[PDB]
């Protein structure tokens, strides 16, 4: 037997960073939860329990906490580089790093209209993640991400048209509620290094929001009988709007709100035009999922 | 042996209910789990396996359905009034009941500036509920809540002149962070009835809107070293700016975020008057209770 | 404005502690998490910002450890009354203490048959806890429990004879799959301190074996066609075997596994009596509740 | 922009099977929870909102629940492989299935030392898995694995000699809490089709059974100073235990506990070859992979 493939590290790792603005007086701050995985030249320590090849998971620790001191945690996409690159550079048996960043909302507060110089809330379950693969000799490979934005709106969404066989039950229609969770992940073009890195930073945060936006308003705009339709729209403006993004992809798990028949109690209208009252499921869900590029 | 007690009924079921207005096209919708408990001559279905006595949990879901159908399902005080008052009217040998309504946010979007007529983002996982309990006789007892409000506060918080001992290591602190779930229920006076409580609709969602206005601005503001103390403005505001609650009451499970010393490292320094990355602990936690009342 | 009620603590301390035998050189661990809250003058904490009458909660979690490391942790029903009597009895303001302990699972593994000295496995999310209460010159109150007990029996339930009026749509059946949380439980007859718990150690592991397998066997063996009279029949064995328990409480959720007609697809056969493949349910469930003491007839 | 890549289909489709033994009365349940995810020239729904490609997600449900009320559905490697086989010969335009199946545990009640005919408990939430892959013409590609299986030992096993720099704050030590949960996947040579996959039936059992066997014996008997070398060793034996087995692999998210200092208190010793009393961490959490496959 042999290893084919081997990886370690340390996984949630929680930090929090605050940024005091002297002058203004105003602080920001930012909270993550960090997973790196080293890998390199380390099957003995599988094959001959060797722990001489191995940087301990605790030290990693520590070293997203120093490197988090002494460096900018913002963008995560710039943040993730730089951890990443300290992998590889500091340790000649180690050849690539992968640092997954999960970025956690603290929304400053409006009191009165202003906003609170330190007091924050979070907004909401979403998350602005990144995904860094730092590999030795093949540059920086970052897919970039927003996860957990759930959204409903409550008509200008049909389905019809759709096959149907003798394993199909459900009926066509022209006004349906849609409601996901969405997923949305642009994978940049690859960078030499650490500097090309930070020569594009602005990209970054503007290509988020751009996502973001889009995101929502095609969502809320668009009247379809496709949720295919529809994410790929999505993708199509993102790819227009950023040219170094080379793929943008969509995962909508698309849960129901069913119909609930009340006609037989005193002939209770609640179905079709009707329909007000609706019984939101759990599960089973849809699940639409896919990958737009460039032609 | 002998039944002491006894309650039985639905729980989780979730609904869903959308407002058209035909003029201006506007939609609105509302989404809340609900769980309905009843109480009543039904000791026979425990000890002698006699369910004649009992109305199906079945059927108490269908009648949740209905009950929506026909009435306003807002405020939830009064759809739970309404919705437990049912239960005690229809059934001879029911003489109580208990509706719990969890509410769900479904937040109506701004695209490009201007509300969005019928799309809707879940733009926080914090609720707003109410525990209706409606007993024969007695009439109702409504509390109403918010909850899973997560607040954090940079600076502008202290700890220090606690009692120290021998089990004591906790160092005092001029600066710290402060951060919490907020879990605050106020207690309305009884009412009489479903008349009563339809005369004061208006001030249910005028409480709410008061009482996370007040949470938000006294954590935002208040620079304390005592949590408690800070609690208690809370409920005092909230007693003083609406007659009708008999009391208020707080639970704060405190969010720690431990400094990290890093001096061990090339003395970097990062404690104190330097502490600039922090470690979030998710547990344990402190816990703070109170209920405050009229003096 | 005054205060009615106040209570303050530590949440979510985990514990974990191992006991070695060195003759035999087994090893034993036990691992729960435990809150404490506190009662007592504390008042002006809350109307005067006084911190010099609390205790902070970083110290009650230092306190868990202490008390841990100087005593036994098992069963929990002790452990808990030590613990809340210490903090009554070395603080004069502190005048009640609410102990609350979850135990975790971490059954010795069997390897070849044979147990093994010092390999766990979390075989179930099932938890043994106890509530624990403390008040000065009230005694010792203690609520013990078992709960993330889930059970499914695939028949011998039934549901028919209920109410029907014009809500109902349920069917009536005599045959159904009938799966539940268990949730269970017994209420100890006041101590008056830790002496007399301490004089009743013994007790308490056997009244949680008898409380889960009374539980277990009841479930299997009951045909019933009311939840609420099997939790009843539970709740007696238990009172019955256990006179220093006063009272019993049941609280099972049940979860719906629903019949899927597949008669629209070539006349498939799929209900009643044919009924094979069901849609288990994630909500809504019902909920039956119960509490059952003794008798005060002869 | 182009379509680079499309799935979709029903996620979290919960089912229940029970078998009845006429002679014996003997019940056995199954119950697993399963997703289907189709690929195929399925582009226009999402290029030109084109539905007529579209197989409803609601008929990929009703099929599961057909085809498990016609079939075994164990062991789930058969199950998928026939489920996933459906899409592909039924469609035209379907050329891949990927089905994932999770199985929960409900093992057999021992009443006064006798198996019960049928009564359950969800003795643990250890989960059974298959990702079952379909590919036209390409056979299909059985990945098996278990999961949930969380363990500890109190004793035998150490950590020295690994890396040390400045970056290094970690004590080395012979003796320490080894804890995690585990995650292990065995992926089976690619099968021609449907009846290849009939003829090794009895394999699947059996390896499960193996897999799990040697994982928790090498846990609780190896005495390592490396989680990587006892993986190791128990993708080995696994290998070694049945041919047709490509690669093994494993995920262990080691669970830490830490030494509590209590000399600060009364002196009192509770470290080193004292240590009694632990703080169990809820994280970070170090994280060990590796696939290994046959020389
Ligand atoms: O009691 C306590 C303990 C810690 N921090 C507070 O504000 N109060
Ligand atoms: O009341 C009820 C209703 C359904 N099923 C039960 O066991 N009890
Ligand atoms: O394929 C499908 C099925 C259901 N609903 C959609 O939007 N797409
Ligand atoms: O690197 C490490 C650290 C802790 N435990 C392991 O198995 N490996």
Same mark, same amino acid.
């Given at each position: ?9 340390? &996984? ?7 940024? @005091? &603005? ?8 930012? *909270?993550? =939860? ?15 329990? &060797? ?8 030290? $990693? ?8 001191? +002494? ?11 730089? /951890? ?5 550079? @500091? ?9 997954? $960043? ?18 924050? $809330?979070?907004?909401?379950? *979403?998350? %602005? ?19 957990? /934005?759930?959204?409903? !709106?409550?008509?200008?969404? +049909?389905?019809?048209?759709?096959? %149907?066989?003798?394993? =199909? ?10 409601? =996901? ?7 940049? !073009? ?77 002939? /209770? ?13 759990? &599960?089973?869900?849809?699940? $639409? ?7």
């Amino acid at each position: 037997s042999a290893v084919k493939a081997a990886r370690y590290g340390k &996984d949630n790792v929680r930090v929090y960073k605050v940024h @005091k &603005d002297e002058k203004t007086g105003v602080q920001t701050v930012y *909270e993550m =939860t960090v997973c790196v995985l080293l890998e390199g030249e380390i099957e003995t320590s599988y094959t001959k329990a &060797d722990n001489s090849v191995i940087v301990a998971t605790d030290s $990693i620790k520590n070293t997203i906490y120093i490197t988090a001191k +002494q460096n900018p945690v913002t963008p995560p996409e710039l943040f993730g580089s730089i /951890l990443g690159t300290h992998f590889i550079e @500091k340790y000649n048996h180690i050849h690539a790093a992968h640092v997954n $960043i999960v970025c956690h909302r603290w929304t400053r507060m409006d009191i009165d209209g202003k906003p609170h110089p330190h007091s924050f $809330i979070r907004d909401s379950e *979403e998350k %602005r993640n990144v995904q860094v693969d730092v590999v030795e000799g093949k540059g920086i490979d970052i897919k970039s991400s927003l996860s957990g /934005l759930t959204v409903l !709106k409550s008509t200008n969404s +049909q389905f019809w048209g759709f096959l %149907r066989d003798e394993y =199909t039950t459900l009926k066509e229609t022209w006004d349906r509620i849609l409601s =996901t969770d969405v997923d949305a992940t642009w994978q940049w !073009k690859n960078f030499s290094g650490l500097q090309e890195v930070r020569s594009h930073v602005p990209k970054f945060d503007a290509t988020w929001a751009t996502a973001r936006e889009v995101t929502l308003k095609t969502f809320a705009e668009d009247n379809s009988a496709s949720v295919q339709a529809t994410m790929y729209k999505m993708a199509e403006q993102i790819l227009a709007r950023q040219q170094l993004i080379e793929t943008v992809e969509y995962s909508l798990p698309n849960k129901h709100y069913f119909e609930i028949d009340l006609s037989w109690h005193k002939g /209770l209208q609640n179905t079709g035009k009707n329909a007000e009252v609706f019984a939101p499921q759990s &599960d089973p869900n849809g699940l $639409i999922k896919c990958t737009v590029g460039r032609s």
